[PDB]
Amino acid sequence: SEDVGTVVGIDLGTTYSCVGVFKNGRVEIIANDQGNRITPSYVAFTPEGERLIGDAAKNQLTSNPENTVFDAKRLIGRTWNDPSVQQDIKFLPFKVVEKKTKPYIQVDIGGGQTKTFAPEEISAMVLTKMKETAEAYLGKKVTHAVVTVPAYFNDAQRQATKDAGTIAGLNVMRIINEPTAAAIAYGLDKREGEKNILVFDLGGGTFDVSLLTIDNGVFEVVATNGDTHLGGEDFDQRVMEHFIKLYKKKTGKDVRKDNRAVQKLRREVEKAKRALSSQHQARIEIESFYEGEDFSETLTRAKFEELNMDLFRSTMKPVQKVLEDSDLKKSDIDEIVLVGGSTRIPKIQQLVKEFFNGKEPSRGINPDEAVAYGAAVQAGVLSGDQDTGDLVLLDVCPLTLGIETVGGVMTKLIPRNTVVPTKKSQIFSVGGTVTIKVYEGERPLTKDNHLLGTFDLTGIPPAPRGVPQIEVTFEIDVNGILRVTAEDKGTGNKNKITITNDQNRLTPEEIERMVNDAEKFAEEDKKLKERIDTRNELESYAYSLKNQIGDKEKLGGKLSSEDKETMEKAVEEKIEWLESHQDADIEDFKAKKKELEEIVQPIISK
Amino acid sequence: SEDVGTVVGIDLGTTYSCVGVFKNGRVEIIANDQGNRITPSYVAFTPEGERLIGDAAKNQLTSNPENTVFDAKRLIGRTWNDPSVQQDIKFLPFKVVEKKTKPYIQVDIGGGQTKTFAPEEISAMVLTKMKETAEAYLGKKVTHAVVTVPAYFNDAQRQATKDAGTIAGLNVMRIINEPTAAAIAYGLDKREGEKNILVFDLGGGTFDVSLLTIDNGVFEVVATNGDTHLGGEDFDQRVMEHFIKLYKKKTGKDVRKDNRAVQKLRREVEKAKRALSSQHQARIEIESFYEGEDFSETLTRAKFEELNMDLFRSTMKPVQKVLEDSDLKKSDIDEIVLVGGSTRIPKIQQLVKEFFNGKEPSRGINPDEAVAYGAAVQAGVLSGDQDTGDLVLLDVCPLTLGIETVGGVMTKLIPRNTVVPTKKSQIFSVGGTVTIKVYEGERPLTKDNHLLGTFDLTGIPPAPRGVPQIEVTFEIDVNGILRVTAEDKGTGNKNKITITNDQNRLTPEEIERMVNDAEKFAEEDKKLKERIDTRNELESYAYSLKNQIGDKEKLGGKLSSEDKETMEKAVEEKIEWLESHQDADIEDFKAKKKELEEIVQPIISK
Numbered sequence A, B: 001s002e003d004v005g006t007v008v009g010i011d012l013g014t015t016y017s018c019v020g021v022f023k024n025g026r027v028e029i030i031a032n033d034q035g036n037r038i039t040p041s042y043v044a045f046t047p048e049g050e051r052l053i054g055d056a057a058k059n060q061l062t063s064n065p066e067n068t069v070f071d072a073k074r075l076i077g078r079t080w081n082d083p084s085v086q087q088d089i090k091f092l093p094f095k096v097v098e099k100k101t102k103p104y105i106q107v108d109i110g111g112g113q114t115k116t117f118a119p120e121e122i123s124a125m126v127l128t129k130m131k132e133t134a135e136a137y138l139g140k141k142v143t144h145a146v147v148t149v150p151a152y153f154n155d156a157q158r159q160a161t162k163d164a165g166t167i168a169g170l171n172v173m174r175i176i177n178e179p180t181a182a183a184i185a186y187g188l189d190k191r192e193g194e195k196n197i198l199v200f201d202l203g204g205g206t207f208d209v210s211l212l213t214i215d216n217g218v219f220e221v222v223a224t225n226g227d228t229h230l231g232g233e234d235f236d237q238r239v240m241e242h243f244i245k246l247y248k249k250k251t252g253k254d255v256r257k258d259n260r261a262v263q264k265l266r267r268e269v270e271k272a273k274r275a276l277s278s279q280h281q282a283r284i285e286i287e288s289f290y291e292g293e294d295f296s297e298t299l300t301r302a303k304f305e306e307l308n309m310d311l312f313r314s315t316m317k318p319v320q321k322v323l324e325d326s327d328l329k330k331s332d333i334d335e336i337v338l339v340g341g342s343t344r345i346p347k348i349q350q351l352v353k354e355f356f357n358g359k360e361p362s363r364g365i366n367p368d369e370a371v372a373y374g375a376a377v378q379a380g381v382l383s384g385d386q387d388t389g390d391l392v393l394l395d396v397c398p399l400t401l402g403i404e405t406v407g408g409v410m411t412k413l414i415p416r417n418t419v420v421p422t423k424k425s426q427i428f429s430v431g432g433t434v435t436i437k438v439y440e441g442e443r444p445l446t447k448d449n450h451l452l453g454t455f456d457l458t459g460i461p462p463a464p465r466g467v468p469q470i471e472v473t474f475e476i477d478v479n480g481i482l483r484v485t486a487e488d489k490g491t492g493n494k495n496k497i498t499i500t501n502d503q504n505r506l507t508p509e510e511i512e513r514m515v516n517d518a519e520k521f522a523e524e525d526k527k528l529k530e531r532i533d534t535r536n537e538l539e540s541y542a543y544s545l546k547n548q549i550g551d552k553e554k555l556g557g558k559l560s561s562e563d564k565e566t567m568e569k570a571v572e573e574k575i576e577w578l579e580s581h582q583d584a585d586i587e588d589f590k591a592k593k594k595e596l597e598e599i600v601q602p603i604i605s606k
């Protein structure tokens, strides 16, 4: 069977991502090359064409706002005409343009070239950085992964996330819903009897609530609901609007035409928001904010709350929906599990606590890392060779699926909160071409909901005297993704044929072109890391020699006058060279190291 | 048997204190009347003579620095000539004076009176505030408690902490060492097999390390070591000294003479220190800092680390000591548990991780609350009627005890890290009067260590022809406190008489006077809470009526013109009165409420 190697769990988040592995009976949340256990979901292309991902990309955002990309999770799997897309792109500094029917991110990638990237490709870059982080930690290549999605992601958003994994060179063995992952983190070693757990997940871009039953490693989602365009970024944007208006009232200046100013303001607003989770006021100060003038304003917690109060209060509606859908009352909830960084907000914690009549949330749960933690546990299970303890997951589809047959019935097919995998079939006996539209959502008229896709039954061949009997099967798989197949029942013949969605999902050929593109940049990453590693080696070697020569009681005391002169000359020459050749290639660093060695050795070996 | 009621667990900390209870199978960490689950270990007396404790005391520190008291845990149980006391009092703004050979805190308590308080009385006020917090949450009186102490507290510091509990009206059922409490928090529900746990506890004033073995609710400390004058406050003081020097060089001004300036600087330094645990830079700004001039400086994380590098590095020595005393090597440690707020410092976490060759600390442990959590669990066990699961604790004495008998031998008695309770006896056959000094510490000459106390055997019978046989017993009890008793073996008699320590600890009579004093203030607290509660009732009633009268589609629409006028008038009159009588007594609020009611009822009942 396939060697899946070490399987990693990746929480692919709107603003931050996080990767973990299950090793030696425990989860390791893996720190990146800057020592951070979470990584900004940012990518950028420098003026010289270098691809940056993560902390480096975020760090140069204000200097390069149009070619820095973030919040791609708010675009992934969506179409151009999605009202959410059209609202969000107004506030993103990078260009987003329509290609056929989808939002593509357009940036300058160097060499005078402009490139348009599918959101899948941007998210694949983030996944690649998480993969690189894991590989660095493990000292070996990673090929397989469990990747998270919001529970309320629709079919296309799920498929697009899986495609991002493929483009990053990952076999995505499982797409896991974020609250379900957090539930595993909470409950893996719990031995407290069967309990109802409410997971309240409010991150940087999305909001999910799921109600689970948990009993000794058996986890079942009973109901889920959410909002895929509600999270910390929206709270930031409410504050930014406030201060842009305030600044215009105070100075007469509208700074929105200035990307650099707006992004400096965004950076400080984010820091202020975080401060306000433990302070009651925060000062926002920006030196030479706009046209030379300084910015200095105070944001009180009360104002932050006021600016966001409708958004904060709206998180209670999905809680009420999952309680109703689970046939439970408030008091039936045994534990409340808060995850996602925005659950650090005091007004959020208060709203949830008050909703549940004073019941306090479960403790010891890191809201930034719990999702990655659970993903890592499921990855450990799928690895096969781990001591995870037993783990059984039963999850559900978030949206009612219904179909509209042109010239046929329109009907509900699979209700929301149905345990997956699940399937439903429909017989078509009409003959000729059959066209079926699939919709997702809870409005009573099926076609008033979100269009998932259009599926055509082309080849129903004759059936002399007999009745046409085409069975179409709609199956939602364990990843929450729909596959439509058809088989002729009248023929008896066995071949189920997959019907492709007319709505233009990435094809395997398109995906492979994106993979090849990604692999070019990955090769650059590899060579850069090797180059920097050998530069670091030369640097440490030279400075070490410098210290030894200066030690009068060891080597510096053993060296003759003459040899000591020669040694110092050689080492200081190499250090000078280093200071002026930081950008040299691997070969040059190696060669300078060996020159220095061939000078030093006949001397120290005396 | 005694009804111990609901037993609370109180972490009595240098800078913050925290109280928990075990109810319904879980620990509740109890929020105070300001919603905070930790409370500043601060007390103050307002110019009008009101005693403030906790958040209110800390809030007015800069306006009243000489009559605000904090860091009493660095004085409790110590003598005047203790080098630690003499060093610390130089940086405390309140007066500390010598009496009973001890440091007493001298403050103005109002009415033109100056009072000197034992450190035990100050800590008793903090314990009283924690008690009040618990009673508010529980809706009933609390009489019994488990109170924490640093593992490395000596005999007198332990006894003084217990006495503080008594003065606060608490029967302290157990004194529990802070790392042992943290270990219970970590391991209560763990089912991972026998493991060695290293608890590294760095709080606001003290540092403890303990190595434990844990196996399914059996917790045994193998070795412990620490520093009772090393913690967050010291790091703050290093930064303080830095900026006072910097300000003097910059302006020529020495602000040390100005208590208000110094305490503003301290407040902002504490804020900055906390910021630097997640940022690399922090801005310290104080408006009208000194003689009208503003303060504005930046503290980098690198500078904070440099200012404290010797202190940070010194925490590794106790780790090495407990590893050696446990006969273990670094790799034998299965879990590292960090507790105490100062373990949030990145350089600290780095030093610990590097010491243990990359081993990461256990996750999901709140460093501010874990000690109170464990104390709450042990309190739950002592309550008797809780479902805590089984819990067995074996703890040790931190210091070697030895004795010096005047005219007799000097000898080690009880080695450090001996499991307690434990006892050791010595026979004296000399007759006359026997004087025994008891010393604590590890220096090879017993009397070079810390003097615990002096004990005299007065009544030794000279029995006819037979030789005197007085057995003196030195017992360390389960609280870690020494009791010295004597019995006559030659007599035969079984009556063991307790020998009182000449180094006079508080006597029961002195303690009861302190209790009576505390109880007067507690009565003031009670009356204030009642008064404020009824003022709040009148307020809410009046404003409620205001809202109802303005509701045109219910009461406002029901009321006649006339009656509405009378209603509005009555309510507005009462609100005016409230706005000018915030300081009215209880019966006045009651009377105004009753008057308003008597006006409103004949009208709304139409």
Ligand SMILES: Nc1ncnc2c1ncn2[C@@H]1O[C@H](COP(=O)(O)OP(=O)(O)OP(=O)(O)O)[C@@H](O)[C@H]1O
Pocket: A011, A012, A013, A014, A015, A016, A017, A073, A178, A202, A203, A204, A205, A206, A207, A231, A232, A233, A270, A273, A274, A275, A277, A339, A340, A341, A342, A343, A344, A345, A367, A368, A369
């Ligand atoms: N102390 C804090 N106070 C308020 N908000 C915070 C705090 N810390 C982090 N956040 C917010 O949390 C968000 C990031 O949370 P996290 O990374 O857990 O979610 P995510 O995985 O990015 O989002 P999603 O799951 O929605 O894709 C950011 O919006 C950030 O501003």
Ligand SMILES: Nc1ncnc2c1ncn2[C@@H]1O[C@H](COP(=O)(O)OP(=O)(O)OP(=O)(O)O)[C@@H](O)[C@H]1O
Pocket: B011, B012, B013, B014, B015, B016, B017, B073, B178, B202, B203, B204, B205, B206, B207, B231, B232, B233, B270, B273, B274, B275, B277, B339, B340, B341, B342, B343, B344, B345, B367, B368, B369
């Ligand atoms: N983020 C942070 N970075 C640095 N220090 C912090 C941080 N948060 C809290 N501290 C420090 O932690 C200390 C308080 O810790 P905590 O209350 O757990 O200990 P304590 O019980 O007061 O002290 P002790 O046990 O020594 O008597 C204070 O010195 C505080 O400044």
